[PDB]
C-alpha cells in the first residue's frame, strides 16, 4: 500500500507516446512530390492522416478508461503496479493492430488481432478491479468508506467488460503535457536523426563547404522553429486555462482530446509551409492548411473553457468566473490564437498575394502578444472605462 500518483504519471507518459505514435509516418511522408506526383502522394498522405486520427482517438478512449479505472482505485502496491504495467503493454498494440486492420480490412486476421488486443486490455483492467476490490483498502476513500460498496463491486467491473462526469484533472493535465511535449519536439527528432551533414556529402555536393549544407537544411530548421513556437504557445494557453479549473467534466475531456488531436498536425503543417512552393500559387494552400490546423487546435481549448464557464460555479475558480479579476485576461489568452489564425486564413483569400507575409507576421506577433497580453488587456480595459 502506497501512493499511486507516480505510477499514474508514468502511465500518462506512456499513453501520450502511444497516442502520438502514428504521426511519425505522417511527418516522414514524401513532402516534395515533384513532377506532380501529388496525384498519388496526397492520397497516401490522407490515408496516413486518417489512420493517425483514428488511432489517437482510440488510444484516448483507452486512456479515459484507464483513468476511470485508477479513479475507483486509489492506492497501489507491487501487484497493482505490475498489473498496470501489463495493461500498458497491452495498450501499446492498439496503434499497430488498428493500422494493420485498416491496411487489410478484407482479411479477417487484422480485425481478429484488434479484437484480441481490446479483449486483452479489458481482461487486465478487470483483473486490476478484482484485485483492488478483494483488498478493500486499495479502493478510493469513498468507495471503501461507502456502505453501498456492493453495487460498486459490479458497476465499473461491468463498465470495463455522461457529459457531466468528473474526470481526473491531474491526469488530463499529464496527458496533455505529454502530447504537447511530443508534438513540439516531433520534427527535431527528424533533424537529429537523419539531417546531420555527412562528411562525404559536403565534400562532393557542396565542395567541402559545411555552411552550404547547413543552408540547404535551413528550411527544416525554420519548420522546427515555427512548430515549436506554435505548439509551446498553445501549451501555454492550455496551462493557463487549467490553472484556473477546479473540475474537468467529460465534455472538457472530449474538447481537450480534439484539441490535442488537431495539435498533432502542426508539425506537418509547418513542414509543408517551409517546403517553399515550386509554383507560388500553392503556397496559398499551404498557408491555408497551416492556419486552419492552428485554428482547430486552439478553438477547442476556447470551447473547453466556455463549456467550463457553463458551470463555472462548480467547475472554475472564482478568479475566472464571469466578471472575475482575470476573466477578460483568460478570454484574451484563449482566443488569441483562434482570432489570429482566422484572420490570417481570411487574408489568404481577401488579401491572397500578401498571405505568406501576413502568416509569417502572425507567427511573430502572437508570441509578443502573449508576452504583453497582461499590459494590452490593461490598456483595453482602461480605454473601455472612459469611452
Amino acid at each position: 500500500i502506497q501512493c499511486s500518483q507516480r505510477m499514474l504519471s508514468f502511465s500518462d507518459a506512456l499513453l501520450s507516446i502511444i497516442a502520438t505514435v502514428m504521426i511519425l509516418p505522417v511527418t516522414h511522408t514524401e513532402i516534395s512530390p515533384e513532377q506532380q506526383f501529388d496525384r498519388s502522394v496526397q492520397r497516401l498522405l490522407a490515408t496516413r492522416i486518417a489512420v493517425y486520427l483514428m488511432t489517437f482517438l482510440i488510444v484516448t478512449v483507452a486512456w479515459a478508461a484507464h483513468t476511470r479505472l485508477f479513479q475507483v482505485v486509489g492506492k497501489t502496491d507491487d501487484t497493482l503496479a505490475l498489473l498496470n504495467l501489463a495493461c500498458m503493454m497491452t495498450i501499446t498494440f492498439l496503434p499497430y493492430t488498428f493500422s494493420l486492420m485498416v491496411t487489410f480490412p478484407d482479411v479477417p486476421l487484422g480485425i481478429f488481432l484488434f479484437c484480441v488486443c481490446v479483449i486483452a486490455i479489458g481482461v487486465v483492467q478487470a483483473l486490476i478491479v478484482g484485485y483492488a476490490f478483494h483488498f478493500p483498502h486499495l479502493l478510493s476513500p469513498q468507495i471503501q468508506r461507502s456502505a453501498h460498496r456492493a453495487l460498486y463491486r459490479r458497476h465499473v467491473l461491468g463498465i470495463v467488460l455522461d457529459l457531466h462526469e468528473p474526470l481526473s484533472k491531474e491526469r488530463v493535465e499529464a496527458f496533455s503535457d505529454g502530447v504537447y511535449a511530443i508534438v513540439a519536439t516531433l520534427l527535431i527528432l527528424d533533424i537529429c536523426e537523419d539531417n546531420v551533414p555527412d562528411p562525404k556529402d559536403v565534400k562532393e555536393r557542396f565542395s567541402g563547404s559545411l555552411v552550404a549544407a547547413l543552408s540547404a537544411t535551413g528550411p527544416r530548421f525554420l519548420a522546427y522553429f515555427g512548430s515549436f513556437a506554435t505548439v509551446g504557445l498553445l501549451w501555454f494557453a492550455h496551462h493557463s486555462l487549467f490553472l484556473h479549473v477546479r473540475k474537468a467534466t467529460r465534455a472538457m475531456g472530449l474538447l481537450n482530446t480534439l484539441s490535442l488531436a488537431f495539435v498533432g498536425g502542426l508539425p506537418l503543417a509547418y513542414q509543408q509551409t517551409s517546403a517553399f512552393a515550386r509554383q507560388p500559387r500553392d503556397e496559398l494552400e499551404r498557408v491555408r492548411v497551416s492556419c486552419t490546423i492552428i485554428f482547430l487546435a486552439s478553438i477547442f481549448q476556447l470551447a473547453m473553457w466556455t463549456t467550463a464557464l457553463l458551470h463555472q460555479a462548480e467547475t472554475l475558480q472564482p478568479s475566472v468566473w464571469f466578471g472575475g479579476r482575470e476573466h477578460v485576461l483568460m478570454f484574451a489568452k484563449l482566443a488569441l490564437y483562434p482570432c489570429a489564425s482566422l484572420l490570417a486564413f481570411a487574408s489568404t483569400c481577401l488579401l491572397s498575394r500578401f498571405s505568406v507575409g501576413i502568416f509569417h507576421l502572425m507567427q511573430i506577433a502572437v508570441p509578443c502578444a502573449f508576452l504583453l497580453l497582461r499590459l494590452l488587456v490593461g490598456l483595453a480595459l482602461a480605454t473601455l472605462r472612459v469611452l
Binding site: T292, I299, L342, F345, A346, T348, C349
Partner: peptide, 28 residues
C-alpha cells in the same frame, strides 16, 4: 470555392463558441 467553404465552417465554429459564451453569461 472550398477555401470560402472552410472559412465559413470556421466562422460557424467561432460563432457557436460565442453562443456558448453568451449562454454561460446569462446563466451566471
Amino acid at each position: 470555392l472550398i477555401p470560402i467553404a472552410v472559412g465559413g465552417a470556421l466562422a460557424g465554429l467561432v460563432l457557436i463558441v460565442l453562443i456558448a459564451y453568451l449562454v454561460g453569461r446569462k446563466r451566471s
